[PDB]
Amino acid sequence: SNAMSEWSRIAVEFGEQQLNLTELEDFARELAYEGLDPALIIKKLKETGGDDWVKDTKFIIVFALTRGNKIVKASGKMSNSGSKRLMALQEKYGLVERAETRLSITPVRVAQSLPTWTCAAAAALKEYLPVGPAVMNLKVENYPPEMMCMAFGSLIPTAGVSEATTKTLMEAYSLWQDAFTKTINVKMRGASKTEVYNSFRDPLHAAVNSVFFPNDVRVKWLKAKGILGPDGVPSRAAEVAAAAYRNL
Amino acid sequence: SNAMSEWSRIAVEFGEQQLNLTELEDFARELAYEGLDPALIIKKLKETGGDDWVKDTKFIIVFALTRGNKIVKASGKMSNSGSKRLMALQEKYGLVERAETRLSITPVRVAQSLPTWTCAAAAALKEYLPVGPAVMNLKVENYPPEMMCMAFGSLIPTAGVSEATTKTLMEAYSLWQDAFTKTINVKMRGASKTEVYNSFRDPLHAAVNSVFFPNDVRVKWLKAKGILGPDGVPSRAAEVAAAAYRNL
Amino acid sequence: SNAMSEWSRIAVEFGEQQLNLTELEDFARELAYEGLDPALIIKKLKETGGDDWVKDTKFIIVFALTRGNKIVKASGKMSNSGSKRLMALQEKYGLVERAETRLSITPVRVAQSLPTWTCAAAAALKEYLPVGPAVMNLKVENYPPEMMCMAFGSLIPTAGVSEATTKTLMEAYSLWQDAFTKTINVKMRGASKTEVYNSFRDPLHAAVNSVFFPNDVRVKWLKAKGILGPDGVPSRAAEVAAAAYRNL
Amino acid sequence: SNAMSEWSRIAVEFGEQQLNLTELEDFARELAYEGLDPALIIKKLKETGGDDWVKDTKFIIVFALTRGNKIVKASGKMSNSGSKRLMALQEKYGLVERAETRLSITPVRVAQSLPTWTCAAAAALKEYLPVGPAVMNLKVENYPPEMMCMAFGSLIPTAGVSEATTKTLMEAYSLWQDAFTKTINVKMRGASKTEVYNSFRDPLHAAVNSVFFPNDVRVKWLKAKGILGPDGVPSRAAEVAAAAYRNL
Amino acid sequence: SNAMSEWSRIAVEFGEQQLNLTELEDFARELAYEGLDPALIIKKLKETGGDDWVKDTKFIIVFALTRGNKIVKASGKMSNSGSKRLMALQEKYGLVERAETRLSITPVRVAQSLPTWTCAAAAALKEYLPVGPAVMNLKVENYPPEMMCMAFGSLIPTAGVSEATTKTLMEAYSLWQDAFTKTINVKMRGASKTEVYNSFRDPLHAAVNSVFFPNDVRVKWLKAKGILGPDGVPSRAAEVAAAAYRNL
Amino acid sequence: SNAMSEWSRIAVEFGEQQLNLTELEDFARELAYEGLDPALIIKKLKETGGDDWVKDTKFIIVFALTRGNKIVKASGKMSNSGSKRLMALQEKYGLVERAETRLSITPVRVAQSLPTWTCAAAAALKEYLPVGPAVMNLKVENYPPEMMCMAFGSLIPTAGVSEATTKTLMEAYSLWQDAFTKTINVKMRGASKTEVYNSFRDPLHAAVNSVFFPNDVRVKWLKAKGILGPDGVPSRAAEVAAAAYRNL
């Protein structure tokens, strides 16, 4: 209430405004990290593939699960049948190895757009994953195999479970992400826990906060897989995994 | 009083002059670190924006709070709606990503020019901040959410509170600045506490010493938020935060 | 079961499909790491060499066992007789020093294509190996000399033995691979156990999972060499080696 | 006294000469490190400035005390009034940022040429110094504020005090120099105590050994400031500071 | 005995062949590391030098023993007489500083081609060696001076002594090689024991395995020097040296 | 005595020759490290300088003692009188900053050519030396000031004293050389004791082994300075210094 300049007064009165929380949360969601647009990816696949899109997509996802995004490098070190088919799919769908643009269709983006399929496939193919049971068995007992892939973050619910459940599932999953990031990213070779976490913090939060894949389907699927119990809280293995990550 | 040359005598007599403290403090304030001119920023926004400037500014501040200054990089990884609006605002206001000049309007400069609004918005949007409750909860209990942003330094008062209060508030805030600097600045990756502090010492002191945002408004606002008690000393959470930083 | 968009519904229904495990394992095998095609190598050798191919191949394998892949560098530091013959063989078979392509015939690829011969030859020539009994005797007692070469991975069976046996043999062999990788690869100079393992994980798993060299021949050969006992479990030396690697 | 060659004999007889100590000390003083010529600096200032030189010089010194030598960089981050005046002074006096030549007028050289004024001004402006009471209060209690600047070395006497007093004052001052060197010089980031000392050893000894600023004026000034007691030995704070540096 | 493809069968039958050990050891010797051809060196020296070759060779060997291979660099820092003669010898014999080719005559190659002379000369000139008694006296007592040079490896016998004796002599010698490698090779500056050993493993084994210098002459010479006792086992000093290397 | 080839026999018989020790020591001295030719330096100085050469040389030596070899860099930071005279001397004698050639006259080479004068001058000017009593007083008590310079090595005798005395004097001197090397050579910044020793081992041994400056003059001078006692063994201070270096 002391005398001030007209520019100071503007700053002061600006800050006396009430916050419009609905509007501020809209803005914050529009400006938040987004790693991919799953509806865009699926639309591109289906429109290009027609009646072959489902079978084609499954093959691309197995590649993403087991070899990642590096199409050319990987195709040089794989069976002839696998390489021929992967190269043909790349030409057919315009697959690329890096997400340069919203339009970029990478194998990992395809996997993340269909997360319930991808994570079931990961569990089924757990013996083929670069970071799978062998690695996780050294860290804890009974790491959920559905968590051993880049798509599991999209299946962690925010609605229909407690915030403690959400946090625990994120931590349990971080145990795999931490390991996968370190094995596959050479820039993380000497990084601290906090540094490797920050390399996947934004993509993980974006996957969890996404509205594309409905929370109720996530909860029901996690219950069916036993990752959540019938009461909607994490299984013992999930709690052990989460504890292991917090302790890391 | 021994014989000396005429040049030595000049140096000696120069040093026998009394100091004009009023004049010396004027000089020292004119020459001190200044990071931005808030009146200049607000004038530019209001003159360009007219009756849209307030709503536009709020959106720019949410961006600054949650994504920082990197307009192009961030716009590549966000919703279409957010990116379209941010790009349009950049063209409209001439927003830039680095403070090259007094005239450079960066998103962070906009936030710092309206600090009471920005810090209230930060608390409201604390779950969206890159360095927010999750990080600070690992360090101490109940870190004030209003301190979780680049603008809080401007709200630390020098008049109307004790110097011990000023120092405590600076230390409590440094706990967040230290963390934020380390997460966002890769050059600080292996830096000591003292090195990361020195990266923000001058901007912080300049914010605290600024005459643009009146001290009495700062005190009243900190009391309203509970960061200061009714007696004008820091809350327990502020003291705990400050202790944690001194101990770091 | 809540209302959702048509793109969300597609993702949801995609994930409600049953997995075709036979088809998914086919895909995963086609896309898995493959380091070489042994039938291709042998066909090239035999078609080029005719009735000289066997004797020629044995000489190339001794080179691979004792000097590795670096044809030019090694030929500069060896007897005249050895160098002359190696250079002539290189011209004759189109030998190269790096596996650039499926077609690239490297000395190590030749050795790996004939693994029972190569590993018997390694044991016979153990005093000539760069990483042989002297190195392994410092780590454990009685390291199997047949394991002291790049081809042993192809002789670890997956069928006809328990999975515990397979795992133990892989670990026992890793003790040599770990040492060999460190001595020969300068990029691994400061690498952790996990980092050097990951440098040979994919080639090792590919050798073990290969269908080219029949599992029943592997089991019978390991029994004949005493690496497996008559009951089909690993010898004591193999168990000690495996324990040493786990403990490393 | 054994037979030797005529060249050996010359070397031997050269070394049998008596030393002319007066002449040798003259040579050693002429060849010793010199960082600046204060009479030259003052002459340039006064001849250029005329009746404005005193007020102009005081402003340049406040800049040197608080911002150092980096005229352009600092002027980009300061008030408009400060920047305008500093730039005008640079043009007027030919100020430069690095001492390339005896003629180079840097802000720090100006401060060092008028050391009693500069150190009194430093104490008066101690709350504005980049390395001031906050930093020194963490190291010891009651660090003399007159020592918190680049000019204090010129005020350490060699005549009129004991050599133990001279040494103690140099050590007490080194405590600040050590800290200032580390904060401002990034090349010293990982340097040992001995390495950072050697970065200022020659300039410090040259300041102490300079004949420009008379020893008797130094002693009298240090007594007036309480840095020396009436008996001409260092105050308790000086002894504590010196002990802290020796212990560092 | 299960059905397999014709390419698999070829690999299987290839491995059922008996090994021809005589032939395999011939191949392994032809392909083994060879560092130099001593007969070639001696032939070149004698044919170029005629009746001056012996005296010339002795001078070249003293250079190799005391200064190594760096002819130009060393000649810049030595007496005029030494430099003039060394340069003339270089022109006369085509001496070079690096073994680029079988034909390259380096000073060290000359020394290694005449190893009994070289090692006797090393002992005689032990006070002139860069790595001599001063260095070795810090490691153990009574290090054999004949071992203090690059040629001693050629005098370690494989026939006429036990394999334990051969191994002990190699280890005793490695104590000097380890030290010499570290002092002269700057790339080994931070290398581990194993890394510096691997830098000389192949040259050392090649020297020991060479058939050029007869084993019976080696044994007799080592007995004459007391490095072997009359029973053909290593002296106490050799055992102490070997123990010191194993313990290093 | 077994049958061998004619080239082997030549190598064997070469090694059966008796050593001519007088001739071998001549060769080893001619080929040994030599850092400078003092007679050449003195001849150049005297022939150029005529009757001014003595006074000129003394000035150059004071420069070498206090500032080293860096003529241009040092002249930029010294009194006008000193710089003018040094530059004139450089032109007059063709002084250079690096010993590129036998002919190169560096200030340090001049000092080393007249070592008894230089070391007496060093003691006289000990308060002006970059590495003097202040540094050495931290290491031991009463370090001989005559040892605080680059020329002292030339005054360590090999004849007229015991070898234990020679060794002790070398070690005592190494304590200063070690310190001086570390302060002045930035490449030695993280070097081990052994690495910094090896940087001056050859120059030191060459100075001690030089025949230019007669041993009897050295002994007599060290006795006159008290570095040797009347019995020709090192003073207590020398023994303490030597012990300190061995312990370093």
PDB file of C-alpha atoms in Angstrom, chain A residues 5 19 21 27 29 40 49-50 66 69 79 93 96 115 117 119 122 127 135 145 154 158 162 166 168 186 235 244-245:
ATOM      1  CA  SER A   5       5.246   3.536 -10.138  1.00  0.00           C
ATOM      2  CA  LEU A  19      -6.497 -17.927 -10.410  1.00  0.00           C
ATOM      3  CA  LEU A  21      -7.784 -23.215 -12.004  1.00  0.00           C
ATOM      4  CA  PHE A  27      -3.008 -24.534 -20.387  1.00  0.00           C
ATOM      5  CA  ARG A  29      -1.937 -29.895 -20.160  1.00  0.00           C
ATOM      6  CA  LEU A  40      -2.218 -40.432 -35.469  1.00  0.00           C
ATOM      7  CA  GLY A  49      -2.154 -51.203 -44.460  1.00  0.00           C
ATOM      8  CA  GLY A  50      -5.856 -51.794 -45.015  1.00  0.00           C
ATOM      9  CA  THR A  66      13.315 -57.189 -29.143  1.00  0.00           C
ATOM     10  CA  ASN A  69      14.255 -48.581 -33.239  1.00  0.00           C
ATOM     11  CA  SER A  79      17.855 -63.694 -40.461  1.00  0.00           C
ATOM     12  CA  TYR A  93       4.665 -47.640 -43.868  1.00  0.00           C
ATOM     13  CA  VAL A  96      11.910 -44.336 -39.469  1.00  0.00           C
ATOM     14  CA  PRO A 115       0.071 -50.839 -25.168  1.00  0.00           C
ATOM     15  CA  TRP A 117      -1.098 -55.835 -26.895  1.00  0.00           C
ATOM     16  CA  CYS A 119       2.898 -55.645 -22.952  1.00  0.00           C
ATOM     17  CA  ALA A 122       6.486 -58.704 -24.164  1.00  0.00           C
ATOM     18  CA  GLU A 127      13.060 -64.848 -23.260  1.00  0.00           C
ATOM     19  CA  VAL A 135      18.642 -58.987 -15.797  1.00  0.00           C
ATOM     20  CA  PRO A 145       7.177 -59.581 -17.322  1.00  0.00           C
ATOM     21  CA  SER A 154       0.753 -46.213 -20.721  1.00  0.00           C
ATOM     22  CA  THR A 158      -4.416 -42.366 -12.487  1.00  0.00           C
ATOM     23  CA  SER A 162      -5.114 -44.496  -5.157  1.00  0.00           C
ATOM     24  CA  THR A 166       0.006 -44.935  -9.117  1.00  0.00           C
ATOM     25  CA  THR A 168       4.201 -47.521  -6.595  1.00  0.00           C
ATOM     26  CA  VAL A 186      25.732 -45.114 -24.005  1.00  0.00           C
ATOM     27  CA  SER A 235       0.714 -57.141  -6.035  1.00  0.00           C
ATOM     28  CA  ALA A 244      14.025 -51.975  -4.938  1.00  0.00           C
ATOM     29  CA  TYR A 245      13.868 -48.895  -7.144  1.00  0.00           C
TER      30      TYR A 245
END
